[PDB]
Amino acid sequence: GKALVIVESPAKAKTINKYLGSDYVVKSSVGHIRDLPTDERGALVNRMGVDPWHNWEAHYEVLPGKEKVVSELKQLAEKADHIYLATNLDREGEAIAWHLREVIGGDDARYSRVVFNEITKNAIRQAFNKPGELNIDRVNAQQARRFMDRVVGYMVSPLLWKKIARGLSAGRVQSVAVRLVVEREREIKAFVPEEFWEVDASTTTPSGEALALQVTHQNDKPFRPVNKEQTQAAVSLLEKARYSVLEREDKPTTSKPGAPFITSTLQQAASTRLGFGVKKTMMMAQRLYEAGYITYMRTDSTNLSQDAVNMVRGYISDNFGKKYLPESPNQYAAHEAIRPSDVNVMAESLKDMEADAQKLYQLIWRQFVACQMTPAKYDSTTLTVGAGDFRLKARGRILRFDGWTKVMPALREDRILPAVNKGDALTLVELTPAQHFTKPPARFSEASLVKELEKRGIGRPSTYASIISTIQDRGYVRVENRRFYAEKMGEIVTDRLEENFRELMNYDFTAQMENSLDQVANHEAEWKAVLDHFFSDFTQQLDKAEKDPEEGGMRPNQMVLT
| CB under 8 A, 24+ apart: contacts of 185-189 | 185/485, 185/486, 185/491, 186/486, 186/491, 187/440, 187/441, 188/440, 188/441, 188/443
The residues, ordered by sequence, that sit 6+ positions from 286 with a Cβ below 8 Å of its Cβ are 297
Q: Distance between CA 184 and CA 37 in Å, rounded?
A: 36
Nearest alpha-carbon partner for 462 in 171, 260, 276, 264:
264
Print the SS3 string covering 107-176: CHHHEEECCCCCCCHHHHHHHHHCCECCCHHHHHHHHHHHHHHHHHHHHHHHHHHHHCCCCCCCCHHHHH
Q: Distance between CA 364 and CA 300 in Å, rounded?
A: 15
What is the fold, at CATH topology level, of the domain defined by 141-189+441-562? Topoisomerase I; domain 2 (1.10.460)
Quick check: 420 and 205 in contact, CB under 8 A? yes
- Residues with their C more than 2.5 Å from the N of the next written residue in the chain, i.e. before a break, are 38, 333, 412
CATH code given to domain 1-140: 3.40.50.140
Q: Is 332 a catalytic residue?
A: no
Pick the catalytic residue from 84, 111, 289, 296. 296
Quick check: 490 and 300 in contact, CB under 8 A? no
The residues, ordered by sequence, that sit 6+ positions from 244 with a Cβ below 8 Å of its Cβ are 385, 386, 387, 423, 424, 425, 426
Q: Distance between CA 107 and CA 85 in Å, rounded?
A: 14
The residues, ordered by sequence, that sit 6+ positions from 3 with a Cβ below 8 Å of its Cβ are 23, 24, 25, 80, 81, 82, 83, 84
| CB under 8 A, 24+ apart: contacts of 408-415 | 408/366, 408/370
Q: For this experimental structure, what is the resolution in angstroms?
A: 1.9
Q: Distance between CA 426 and CA 204 in Å, rounded?
A: 5
Q: Distance between CA 156 and CA 160 in Å, rounded?
A: 6
CATH code given to domain 257-374: 1.10.290.10
In order of 26, 248, 438, 519, the CA distances from 524 in angstroms are 36, 59, 49, 5
Q: Distance between CA 325 and CA 314 in Å, rounded?
A: 9
Quick check: 52 and 535 in contact, CB under 8 A? yes
SS3 state at 85: strand
Residue ranges per domain, the chain? 1-140, 141-189+441-562, 190-256+375-440, 257-374
Domain 190-256+375-440 homologous superfamily, CATH = Topoisomerase I, domain 3 (2.70.20.10)
